[PDB]
């Protein structure tokens, strides 16, 4: 019973954990809907850059480098996976 | 081109920076490109929040 828009695969308890790590005390019931929006915005961009390099470099494999770079453009460098 | 429309739509035929900011802030596709800059002598967009209006 998994055949659906997988955005709901980011389950509500998973959302709750993050807010705890973020120091959120009480989470409203509606936050569970808007967050699946924000994360849908964010990955819409970072993958948009990520494919472009790969499509450029004749590579059919999006690689770890071609996402460290794409994160670098947004001004959020990601230490650890390369460089 | 977009600036030229606005100045003519303010009856002035010569582009001046106040006529030039309106063509970038009001054009949604460009606003994401000049999101950081601050055009000199530029003025700002006319905008008052709804809560700011008087009671009536």
């Amino acid at each position: 019973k998994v055949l659906r828009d997988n955005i709901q695969g980011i389950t509500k308890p998973a959302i709750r954990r993050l807010a705890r790590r973020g120091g959120v005390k009480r989470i409203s019931g509606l936050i569970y809907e808007e967050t699946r929006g924000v994360l849908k915005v964010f990955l819409e961009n970072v993958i948009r850059d990520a494919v472009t390099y790969t499509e450029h470099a004749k590579r059919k494999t999006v690689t770890a480098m071609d996402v460290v770079y794409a994160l670098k453009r947004q001004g959020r460098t990601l230490y650890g996976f390369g460089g | 081109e977009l600036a030229g429309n606005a100045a003519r739509d303010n009856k002035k035929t010569r582009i001046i920076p106040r006529h030039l900011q309106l063509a970038v802030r009001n054009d949604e596709e460009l606003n994401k490109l000049l999101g950081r800059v601050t055009i000199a002598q530029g003025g700002v967009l006319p905008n008052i929040q709804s809560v700011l209006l008087p009671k009536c």
Binding site: - | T38, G43, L45, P46, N47, P54
Partner: protein
């Protein structure tokens, strides 16, 4: 007996006036005399090219306005209308300019 506008309505006139025009706002002469004072201890006897004393003015004022605009949501977001000092401390905090 003399006519008086109600409180607040004179402000809204300006909000539609100053947002329309595009001249500078801070008085010119003191604002330069601030930049010499603040810059005095970075280096001795500095001479600002007078083209580049305004160049701060059209670059710091487009930053304060980018601030007062941004607290105005927060003071709105707190069910209020007036901005208060507690508002700015938030406003600069989300951006990351104080913390």
């Amino acid at each position: 007996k003399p006519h008086r506008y109600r409180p607040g309505t004179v402000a809204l006139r300006e909000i539609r006036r100053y947002q329309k025009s595009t001249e500078l706002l801070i008085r010119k002469l003191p604002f330069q005399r601030l930049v010499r004072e603040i810059a005095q201890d970075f280096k001795t006897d500095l001479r600002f090219q007078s083209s580049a004393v305004m160049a701060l003015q059209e670059a710091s004022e487009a930053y304060l306005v980018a601030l007062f605009e941004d607290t105005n949501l927060c003071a709105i977001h707190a069910k209020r209308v007036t901005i208060m000092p507690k508002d700015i401390q938030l406003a600069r905090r989300i951006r990351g300019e104080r913390a």
